């Protein structure tokens, strides 16, 4: 006789108002897992990805991105929740995605997308996003195309080479000059053979890497 919570909004609505790591288990997820719950923006945000200081290596393969990786104890650690957990999370409810972005110049923006859904493994964790809102600009647009997740070892992009092999990261890739929040952690402006930093091109360039990123979700 144990109690399980489907996501962070159920935790917040049940009276837990403190931000931090909690155990949740989406309905069809076979096992519970630790997740960061951000309770500060009206409460009940389940953090699915975080970028903070460049500590974690995001240049991983398919199964690493499938299972999740990174730090799950530190308040400001970096992690990727995991594509299978993303699927189980988003399939149990209709969710809004919020992306909080910050600068190396004390500035912040955000983007919000309705109807955030990640498909199952057989469909390559396809990304579904709805209408855009916010202040960062919509960098996930080029009703959006339905793109599949790609890693260096599993190429599912619309580019001839391997997008994920060049950006050293997994993402829902289309053509590698789009936004990528799992890119290499640089300090603002950066130089390389490709734009493989953490980019939100509507706000900063394709050659300015952001300071912190928080991708979180909450029911609709």
Residues that bind Ca ion (CB under 5 A): 155, 157, 159
Residue 10 CB, shortest distance to Ca ion, in Å, is 39
In angstroms, give the least distance from the CB of 79 to Ca ion: 27
How far apart CA 144 and CA 57 sit, in angstroms, is 29
Shortest distance in whole angstroms from residue 174 CB to Ca ion = 11
Nearer to Ca ion, 21 or 124 (CB): 124
Rounded CA separation 85/34 (Å): 11
Closest CB to Ca ion among residues 20, 61 = 61
Shortest reach from residue 172's CB to Ca ion, in Å: 14
* CB closer to Ca ion out of 100 and 167: 167
Given the complex with Ca ion, which of 114 and 154 has the nearer CB atom?
154
Show the CA angle centred on residue 54, arms to residues 174 and 79, nearest 5°: 70
Is the CB of 159 or the CB of 206 nearer to Ca ion? 159
Q: Which is nearer to Ca ion, 100 or 157 (CB)?
A: 157
Separation between Cα atoms, residue 183 and residue 59, nearest integer Å: 8
Residue ranges of E strands in the chain: 20-24, 33-38, 45-51, 69-70, 79-80, 95-102, 108-118, 127-128, 132-134, 149-150, 171-172, 188-189, 208-209, 212-219
Q: How many beta carbons lie within 10 A of that of residue 135, not counting itself?
A: 12
Closest chain position to Ca ion (CB): 155
Positive or negative, the CA dihedral 208, 212, 217, 220 is: negative
Question: How far is residue 60's CA from residue 81's CA, in Å, rounded to a whole number?
Answer: 13
Output the smallest distance, CB 62 to Ca ion, in A: 14
Please report how close the Cβ of residue 165 comes to Ca ion at its closest, in angstroms. Answer: 9
Q: Which residue has the tokens 């969710």?
A: 95
Distances from the Cα of 212 to the Cα of 108, 109, 144, angstroms = 9, 11, 25
């Amino acid at each position: 006789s144990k109690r399980q919570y489907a996501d962070c909004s159920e935790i917040f609505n049940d009276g837990y108002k403190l931000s931090g790591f909690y155990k949740i288990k989406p309905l069809q997820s076979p096992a519970e897992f630790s997740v960061y719950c951000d309770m500060s923006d009206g409460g009940g945000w389940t953090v699915i990805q975080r970028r903070s200081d460049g500590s974690e290596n995001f240049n991983r393969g398919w199964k690493d991105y499938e299972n999740g990786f990174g730090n799950f104890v530190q308040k400001h650690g970096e992690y990727w929740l995991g594509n299978k957990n993303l699927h189980f999370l988003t399939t149990q409810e209709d969710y809004t995605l919020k992306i909080d972005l910050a600068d190396f110049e004390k500035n912040s923006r955000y983007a919000q997308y309705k109807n955030f859904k990640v498909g199952d493994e057989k469909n390559f964790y396809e990304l579904n996003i709805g209408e855009y809102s916010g202040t960062a600009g919509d960098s996930l647009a080029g009703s959006h195309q339905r793109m599949k997740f790609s890693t260096w070892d599993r190429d599912h992009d619309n580019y001839e080479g391997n997008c994920a092999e060049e950006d050293q990261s997994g993402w829902w890739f289309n053509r590698c000059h789009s936004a990528n929040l799992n890119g290499v952690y640089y300090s603002g402006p950066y130089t390389a053979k490709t734009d493989n930093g953490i980019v939100w091109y509507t706000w900063h360039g394709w050659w300015y890497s952001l300071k912190s990123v928080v991708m979180k979700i909450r029911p609709n």
